[PDB]
């Protein structure tokens, strides 16, 4: 929707990236890292559908890219984003 709504979400995905980078090789057995905590919570905010702990963050992140490509390609859908306003 709103141009602002897009930026906000980009920033989120762009943040999810940041934390994924932070958590790489810092995910240990008995530890709880403020970083992983942030990450796992952000993984949640993506899908309006469900809010359960994501056992495999790959899935929803994928579903999201796929949905996006399928949207950004069809001019019937993403048309509104190409208006002057």
């Amino acid at each position: 929707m709103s141009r602002q709504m897009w930026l906000d979400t980009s920033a989120l995905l762009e943040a999810i990236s940041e934390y994924v980078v932070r958590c790489n090789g810092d995910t240990f057995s008995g530890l709880t890292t403020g970083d992983f905590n942030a990450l796992s919570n952000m993984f949640t905010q993506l899908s309006v559908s469900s809010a359960g702990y994501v056992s495999d963050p790959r899935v929803p992140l994928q579903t999201m890219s796929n949905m996006f490509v399928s949207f950004i390609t069809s001019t019937d859908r993403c048309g509104y984003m190409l208006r002057k306003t």
Partner: protein, 48 residues
Amino acid sequence: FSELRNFFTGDVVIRDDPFDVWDGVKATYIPIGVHGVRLDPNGDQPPL
């Protein structure tokens, strides 16, 4: 007589006024200082 005295000669030193002795004291501690708000370090916890 001299020798008999010198044998029975020995000094002692005593305090003029006796010490004033007290009982122990119950070491009671009370709070001091002001405390502010400290926020949890890890932030929101992961779900489920």
